[PDB]
Design a protein around this ligand. Structure first.
Ligand SMILES: [Zn+2]
Lengths: 94, 47
């Protein structure tokens, strides 16, 4: 694997998780973070892994929100779990 | 007119004008709203 792309994807996973733990919950805060995550992941590999599709679902869902909608406290908790699981599975692929 | 497939969500998009490595800003996917990464998208581009 291209080591620079692996470092960039790994940094992006932790950055989105840290954002969620800091209470970022709006479309305009989360969309760019998830966008850059998904781009960096594809740079490493285009292969499937656990929860890859789920993270795609989330960025599609977040894109359809109106300007100033937030995720619910329990939506945030779900997305965090799904991200943690994707991160574990991406790391196993390495 | 340029057609392409989003490398994030896989939906077909259509944009006005050429889509080359020099186009800036890049077109945005209508479905997931991610700006198209040229290197990931280039094999799918037709004009
Ligand atoms: Zn898309």
């Amino acid at each position: 694997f291209n080591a620079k792309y692996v470092a960039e994807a790994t940094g992006n996973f932790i950055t989105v998780m840290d954002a969620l733990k800091l209470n970022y919950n709006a479309k305009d805060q989360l969309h760019p973070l998830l966008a850059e995550l998904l781009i960096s992941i594809n740079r490493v590999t285009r292969d499937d892994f656990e929860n890859r599709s789920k993270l795609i679902d989330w960025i599609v869902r977040i894109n359809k929100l109106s300007i100033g909608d937030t995720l619910t406290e329990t939506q945030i908790r779900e997305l965090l779990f799904d991200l943690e699981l994707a991160y574990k599975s991406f790391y196993a692929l390495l | 007119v340029s057609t392409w497939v989003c490398p994030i969500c896989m939906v077909s998009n259509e944009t006005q004008g050429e889509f080359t490595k020099d186009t800036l800003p890049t077109p945005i996917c209508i479905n997931c709203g991610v700006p198209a990464d040229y290197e990931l998208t280039k094999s799918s581009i037709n004009c």
